[PDB]
Amino acid sequence: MSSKAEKDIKWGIAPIGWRNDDIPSIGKDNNLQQLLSDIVVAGFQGTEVGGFFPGPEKLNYELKLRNLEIAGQWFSSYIIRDGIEKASEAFEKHCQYLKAINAPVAVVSEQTYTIQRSDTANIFKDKPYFTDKEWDEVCKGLNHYGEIAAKYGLKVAYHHHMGTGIQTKEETDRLMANTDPKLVGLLYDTGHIAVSDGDYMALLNAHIDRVVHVHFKDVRRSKEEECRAKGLTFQGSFLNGMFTVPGDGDLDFKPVYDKLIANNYKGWIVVEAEQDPSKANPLEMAQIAHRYIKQHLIEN
């Protein structure tokens, strides 16, 4: 493969392995400076925006000291709950923030009815389903996000996600078939699809053309099995070790990488694994991931 094709891939690692926003106690005493310098030590070129991150001036300053970039930021969309007008207002503010920090990608998930932050809902069985009319709202809304984002030089990447109305490959297929490819791209996340559908390559193969941002999330299969058997919540499952970084779990990332290269993918691959950093040391994880990427994926 060409070193140029490989050079079109930017490698990052997400802050959620250091510190969790949904469960603030998890990694509470870890900070922005630690994760950014850990990232340099581990060999990655950037990260995504954590909820605890500061404003653009401080973030840019800390990034510049370390020659690091921001790959993107999560946006919780509530088109269904709030209507496209209110949701679009929230989205435009994220867009402003992303541009301020020179980030390319808004990572979007329609969060209405999600069970991913539930204290009780079984993440394997209790997900919501959008109605046909809500699907129309959402697809129209996301095209509009794409229009909003264009103004800022930004791309929208839709995050299929456990516990949401758009989790399965079939749900993703529906979204892809009913949104404009110029406006709505796909965030391909290996772990979310592996856990939903028991397969990660089918989704990639079906929509490689629409992939504009990638998350590498590995799965500890034996832990998945145990979580499913107990009917845990999303948080219960990640606190029980269902997710980890490439090189530490069970997925072979090489077919994914090879597929992206073969398709001249230009953009970010971000390692992302929600764990309790007191148990899975965030630097050690970053290093495990980086060494695997170097040894198992990269050719030049």
Could you give the CA distance from residue 274 to residue 239 in angstroms, rounded to a whole number? 8
Amino acid letter for position 279: K
List of residues 6+ apart from 19 with CB closer than 8 A: 26, 27, 28, 30, 31, 35, 50, 52, 277
Residue 280, domain CATH: 3.20.20.150
**DSSP code, position 296:** I
What string of H, E and C letters represents the secondary structure of 102-131? CCCEEEEEECCCCCCCCCCCCCCCCCCCCC
Phi, psi at 166, each rounded to 5°: -130, 85
What is the enclosing helix (H) or strand (E) of 201? helix 201-207
Rounded to 10 deg, the angle between the 169-177 and 132-151 helix axes is 60
Provide the 3-class DSSP secondary structure of residue 148. Answer: helix
Amino acid letter for position 58: K
Q: Report yes or no: 256 and 190 within 8 Å, Cβ to Cβ.
A: yes
Q: How far apart, in Å, are the Cα atoms of 87 and each of 11, 78, 104, 155? A: 30, 6, 20, 17
Determine how β-strand 46-48 pairs with β-strand 105-110.
Answer: unpaired
| Cα end-to-end span (Å), the chain | 8
Closest by CA position to 274, among listed 156, 138, 163, 185: 163
Closest by CA position to 13, among listed 154, 265, 215: 215
Q: Determine the longest span between alpha carbons in the chain, in angstroms.
A: 49
Rounded to 10 deg, the angle between the 169-177 and 190-197 helix axes is 120
Experimental determination technique: X-ray
Taking residue 1's Cβ as centre, other Cβ atoms within 10 Å add up to 12
Residue-wise burial string across 90-102, b where 16 or more C-beta atoms lie within 10 A, e elsewhere: ebeebbebbbebe
Q: Report yes or no: 242 and 249 within 8 Å, Cβ to Cβ.
A: no
What is the enclosing helix (H) or strand (E) of 61? helix 56-65
Could you give the CA distance from residue 239 to residue 27 in angstroms, rounded to a whole number? 12
How many alpha carbons lie under 13 Å from residue 91 in its C-beta half-sphere? 33
Taking residue 269's Cβ as centre, other Cβ atoms within 10 Å add up to 25
Could you give the CA distance from residue 200 to residue 256 in angstroms, rounded to a whole number? 9
Rounded to 10 deg, the angle between the 56-65 and 32-42 helix axes is 30
Q: Per the structure, how many domains does the chain have?
A: 1
**Torsion sign (Cα): 108, 112, 114, 116:** positive
Amino acid letter for position 210: R
Q: Which two tokens stand for residue 90?
A: 């929230």
Q: How far apart, in Å, are the Cα atoms of 299 and each of 63, 176, 257? A: 28, 32, 11
Rounded-to-5 percentages of helix, strand, coil across the chain: 45, 15, 40
The residues with which 158 forms a beta bridge, in sequence order, are 108, 186
List of residues 6+ apart from 103 with CB closer than 8 A: 49, 69, 70, 71, 72, 73, 154
Determine how β-strand 218-219 pairs with β-strand 243-244.
Answer: antiparallel
Could you give the CA distance from residue 158 to residue 299 in angstroms, rounded to a whole number? 29
Q: Which two tokens stand for residue 40?
A: 């340099």
What is the enclosing helix (H) or strand (E) of 219? strand 218-219
Rounded to 10 deg, the angle between the 56-65 and 79-100 helix axes is 50
Structural domain span for residue 67: 2-300
Q: Report yes or no: 227 and 196 within 8 Å, Cβ to Cβ.
A: no
